[PDB]
């Protein structure tokens, strides 16, 4: 996701564009950072997540912003773990979200 962010930040900061970034399953970003936090021997926080969950998510999401040059608008697919919106991974993601577009069957 940081690699996609860097490709988007070049278009924002050098090309001066309104970029679109699509983080496909932001929950899998959370789950991957949780795995690398578990493998580095860190104590997991609440429900099972990395102790740095809010900052490992905010390090990605705060680079998606409008600069004076251009902007990055991020469309992130969100998976909700046990159909539980109070789970800390969607509860931390929903602090950063500015819109939801729920697609319905």
């Amino acid at each position: 996701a940081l690699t996609g962010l860097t490709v988007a930040e070049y278009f924002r900061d050098i090309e001066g564009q309104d970029v679109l970034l699509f983080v496909d399953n932001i929950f899998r970003f959370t789950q991957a950072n949780s795995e690398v936090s578990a493998l580095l021997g860190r104590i997991p926080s609440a429900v099972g997540y990395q102790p740095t969950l809010a900052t490992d998510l905010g390090g990605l999401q705060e680079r998606i912003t409008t600069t004076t040059k251009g902007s990055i608008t991020s469309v992130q697919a969100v998976y909700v773990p046990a159909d539980d919106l109070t789970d800390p991974a969607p509860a931390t993601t929903f602090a950063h979200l500015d819109a939801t577009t729920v697609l319905s069957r």
Binding site: P44, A46, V47, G48, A82, D84, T86, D87
Partner: peptide
């Protein structure tokens, strides 16, 4: 909602 709280607390306490 209260079951979701108990599920989260179960995973945290076992961890």
């Amino acid at each position: 909602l209260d079951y979701n709280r108990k599920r989260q607390a179960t995973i945290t306490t076992e961890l």
